[PDB]
Amino acid sequence: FPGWGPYPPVERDETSAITYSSKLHGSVTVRDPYSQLEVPFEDSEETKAFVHSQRKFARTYLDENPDREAWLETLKKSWNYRRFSALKPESDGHYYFEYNDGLQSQLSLYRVRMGEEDTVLTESGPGGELFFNPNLLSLDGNAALTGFVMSPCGNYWAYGVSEHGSDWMSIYVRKTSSPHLPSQERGKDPGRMNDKIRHVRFFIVSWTSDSKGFFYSRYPPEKGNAPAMNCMVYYHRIGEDQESDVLVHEDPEHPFWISSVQLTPSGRYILFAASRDASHTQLVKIADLHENDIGTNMKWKNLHDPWEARFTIVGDEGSKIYFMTNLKAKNYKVATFDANHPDEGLTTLIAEDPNAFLVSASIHAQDKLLLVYLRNASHEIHIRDLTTGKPLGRIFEDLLGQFMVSGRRQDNDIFVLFSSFLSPGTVYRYTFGEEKGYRSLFRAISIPGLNLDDFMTESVFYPSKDGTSVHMFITRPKDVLLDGTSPVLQYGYGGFSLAMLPTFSLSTLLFCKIYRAIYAIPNIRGGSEYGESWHREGMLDKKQNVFDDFNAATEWLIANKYASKDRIAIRGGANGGVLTTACANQAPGLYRCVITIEGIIDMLRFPKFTFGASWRSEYGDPEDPEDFDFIFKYSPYHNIPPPGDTVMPAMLFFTAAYDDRVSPLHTFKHVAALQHNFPKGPNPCLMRIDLGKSTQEMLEETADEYSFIGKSMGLTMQT
Amino acid sequence: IGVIGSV
Ligand code: NA
Ligand code: NA
Ligand code: NA
Ligand code: NA
Ligand code: NA
Ligand code: NA
Secondary structure: OOOOOOOOOOOOOOOOEEEEEEOOOEEEEEEOOOHHHHOOHHHOHHHHHHHHHHHHHHHHHHHHOHHHHHHHHHHHHHOOOOEEOOOEEOOOOEEEEEEEOOOOOOOEEEEEEOOOHHHOOEOOEOOOEEEEOHHHOOOOOOOEEEEEEEOOOOOEEEEEEEHHHOOOEEEEEEEOOOOOOOOOOOOOOOOEOOOOEEEEOOOOOEEOOOOOEEEEEEOOOOOOOOOOOOOEEEEEEOOOOHHHOEEEEOOOOOOOOEEEEEEOOOOOEEEEEEEOOOOOOEEEEEEEOOOOOOOOOOOOEEOOOOOOEOEEEEEEEOOEEEEEEOOOOOOOEEEEEEOOOHHHOEEEEEOOOOOOEEEEEEEEOOOEEEEEEEEOOEEEEEEEEOOOOOEEEEEOOOOOOEEEEEOOOOOOEEEEEEEOOOOOOEEEEEEOOOOOOEEEEEEEOOOOOOOHHHEEEEEEEEEOOOOOEEEEEEEEEOOOOOOOOOOEEEEOOOOOOOOOOOOOOHHHHHHHHHOOOEEEEEOOOOOOOOOHHHHHOOOHHHOHHHHHHHHHHHHHHHHOOOOOOOOEEEEEEEHHHHHHHHHHHHOHHHOOEEEEEOOOOOOOOHHHOOOHHHHHHHHOOOOOHHHHHHHHHHOHHHOOOOOOOOOOOEEEEEEEOOOOOOOOHHHHHHHHHHHHHOOOOOOOEEEEEEOOOOHHHHHHHHHHHHHHHHHHHOOOOOO | OOOOOEO
């Protein structure tokens, strides 16, 4: 019997079942003996007993490994490096930039008068002026900034704060003349105005051009996991109580629908958008704010037929609005709408690129249209003439990674933050000119604890089960031998058109260095890496393609002697938890360790909790007889293998006790079912629970994850 | 656009 056992007991309800309609079988009665664990922690002693017993059990196993502390100290020392964003020009004639001196809980906002920016981000420190220090907001540094928008006048700054990481927030307002001071004690937000906008679940704030107020989306007053219902658009006037905010839109008929508004840069036109699922399709309306008082008494005109396409404002020129849209263009395009001829529809300005996903369109230096394409699992910046749509060439085409682009239509320059698996963040300045532009290196992030020249990222292609060519990035020390001995950390997502882009994580390079490991990112189907068709081949009845791509990546690494067959660790979060639990179910013999973060695992019950019903466009509708059949085949909660052909890998599940985005019940129920199916291991299945994440929490979680992988795969730390 | 589980 394994010395760490036995598992904490978990009450079973042997009578708890639901009957689902099935095209193949007529109906299927599914038993759920852990259905009680769907009741929130707050509302159930049973759920409390489970969380507390499972938490202590995991904490005992993890803290017994001395490498847990070794990892925490290694991570803490190495993470103590200065981090910053690109400069962002604002309407108060300051550049704003995020800064962390190394080990602060949260990023701080700094600023510098435009023209004095050559004095910031030096050996001496951030320079400029401290504007907003989120660390002041709470005692533990758990209250995070969820977003901010400066008023067009530059006198006001609207910002979102989530208390206790809870994914509910309040919106606050402060004067740009009221920066945080370094002398302020923690626990309070001094210098803010009385404005308090409660009951907000996502930050979307749009100021009017008069800087008198802003549109926002909120919910009825409410830790719980019931469906997110009755999203409403409100307009808040600066200085008033929230009780005075004017209702702009509700749709009582469709409580699951999410709604918001965006204004054109000029502030003249308002775009209403509703979504009814996670798909890139909207119900869309346009109002002319010059013709309307703000409220439910506004003259909405239809932009296009509902549920065919998504529309995002990218600019305006009087009555003409620039849209980034997927209308009959799944990889997105740029089209113009004339609000003066709404029946004439959209005119194409930039045609769909059939081999490249259009991620953003923005206007710079008056009439330069800057397009960011995703092609070959990395960003490309294309410059177009705004008037004709004519190509003016590429910039930064030598850099393969991702870009954050900063700059407005009225600015002749941009700041571009470049990053990859190996580049932690270089800020370039690009200055547009009469014929050609000028590129300069502004500032680079430097990591004192690590020699980036020791590492490489390989670009390879491998065939999946069905012969589809899949691209994979492989990060490793240059001096690791491909002799089939190296451990692997293999990370995937596969869904919702979300690309796994080259992304800097110091933690992952330290895993590669300390364990002589490879870090593998297969660009599996479900993402946008090769365009929207890459998502379509990895969703609904084709979700199995995602798991097969990931499995085939592992087999390819073993076959080509990158990795020992006995040291594969896999990792995945949210939708990525469908990936890790399905792959663990379908090929347990491939994997030695499985890390699941905030996992979606019950593919039948997901629609019943918070935002889950929106994911029916991705996974299918489990209450639909045809969809039920293909979902039930892989639903990881329902497909745990019998012991015997199966040695189950060691498995660590991360979750909070309350989480709005993925209800922790997915992890609660799956951990119980795994422990019950495999009561004697031999490899432990553990739930690591936390009762805008802080640096401290991220490192303590990373130290559990890495020390658990080390223990489970028999790795020695080679410091 | 939507509320998606990521990370
Ligand atoms: Na546990
Ligand atoms: Na809104
Ligand atoms: Na396949
Ligand atoms: Na993906
Ligand atoms: Na990374
Ligand atoms: Na796991």
